Amino acid sequence: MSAMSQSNRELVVDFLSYKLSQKGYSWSQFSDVEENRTEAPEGTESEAVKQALREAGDEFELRYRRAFSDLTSQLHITPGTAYQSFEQVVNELFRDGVNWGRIVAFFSFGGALCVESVDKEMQVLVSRIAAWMATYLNDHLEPWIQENGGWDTFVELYGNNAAAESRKGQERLE
């Protein structure tokens, strides 16, 4: 509702809009793929987090080395049973602990389910996914993912600077 979550909501939409853009669907104006609000300089934190979010945004499973096909086949949802799916999503997302992995997983999966969900639920479904994504991530994930690092692991993934000065830097003094 109000805890510093503007850039987070604009980021998820940037990527989600990029995948959906191939089909031509956007809640902002049927076209955007950036933010349409944040308006960052793209070279200090927004370019670093955006570029790192993309690089790891496909490393969620890493060459598909975890499970089988389950992001397009069947796909069940409706106004009365979807509530069970959402409750399961967060509950299962708390398995090992809500971290930066939850963002990479919802990136590809959220776009792979959204393309089939919007086409099976009109443009009203995805329009909710954008708001619910912020309400859920802000409900109990913003402080959690950030408490463990979250964005810190993302930038270290695309930057490969995890073994430079981050290991012995924020593990004794900070």
Partner: peptide
Amino acid sequence: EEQWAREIGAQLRRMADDLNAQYER
């Protein structure tokens, strides 16, 4: 109810569980 929700949460957390690796998968 949502019987397919089993994968909507489990398969979602599955790949996301890679976070435990801490960048180093």
